[PDB]
Amino acid sequence: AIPTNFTISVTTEILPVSMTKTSVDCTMYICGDSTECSNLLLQYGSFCTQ
Amino acid sequence: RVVVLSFELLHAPATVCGPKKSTNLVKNKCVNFNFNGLTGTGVLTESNKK
Numbered sequence A: 001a002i003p004t005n006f007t008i009s010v011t012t013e014i015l016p017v018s019m020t021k022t023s024v025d026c027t028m029y030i031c032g033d034s035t036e037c038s039n040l041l042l043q044y045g046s047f048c049t050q
Numbered sequence B: 001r002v003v004v005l006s007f008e009l010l011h012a013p014a015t016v017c018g019p020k021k022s023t024n025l026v027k028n029k030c031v032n033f034n035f036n037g038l039t040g041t042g043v044l045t046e047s048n049k050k
């Protein structure tokens, strides 16, 4: 079975590439500008830097 | 003689309160505020809420 006519087709291929460059401050989310809560938080160490 | 003072805190308008004297309000500055026993720290600005 041999083709005698053809066609040129166009297809769309969608690919995600990036995401929203989120960033988080622990102190606001967890404590909310409260120094005492931050002081208690310091006992946890390097979770937030991580 | 026994007396049991039952209440519930910071969920409705307050009519009874402790003996601390009030102060003047400072707007557009982050301050340590206390309203009806609800404390906090932040900037207080005018708003419209029904």
Ligand SMILES: *[C@@H]1O[C@H](CO)[C@@H](O[C@@H]2O[C@H](CO)[C@@H](O)[C@H](O)[C@H]2NC(C)=O)[C@H](O)[C@H]1NC(C)=O
Pocket: A004, A005, A006, A007
């Ligand atoms: C091969 O096939 C293509 C279609 O895939 C043909 O193109 C059509 O031909 C008809 C008849 O000649 C026209 O009415 C159409 O307008 C053509 N298409 C377009 C997009 O213009 C082509 O003619 C065929 N060739 C042969 C030799 O059969």
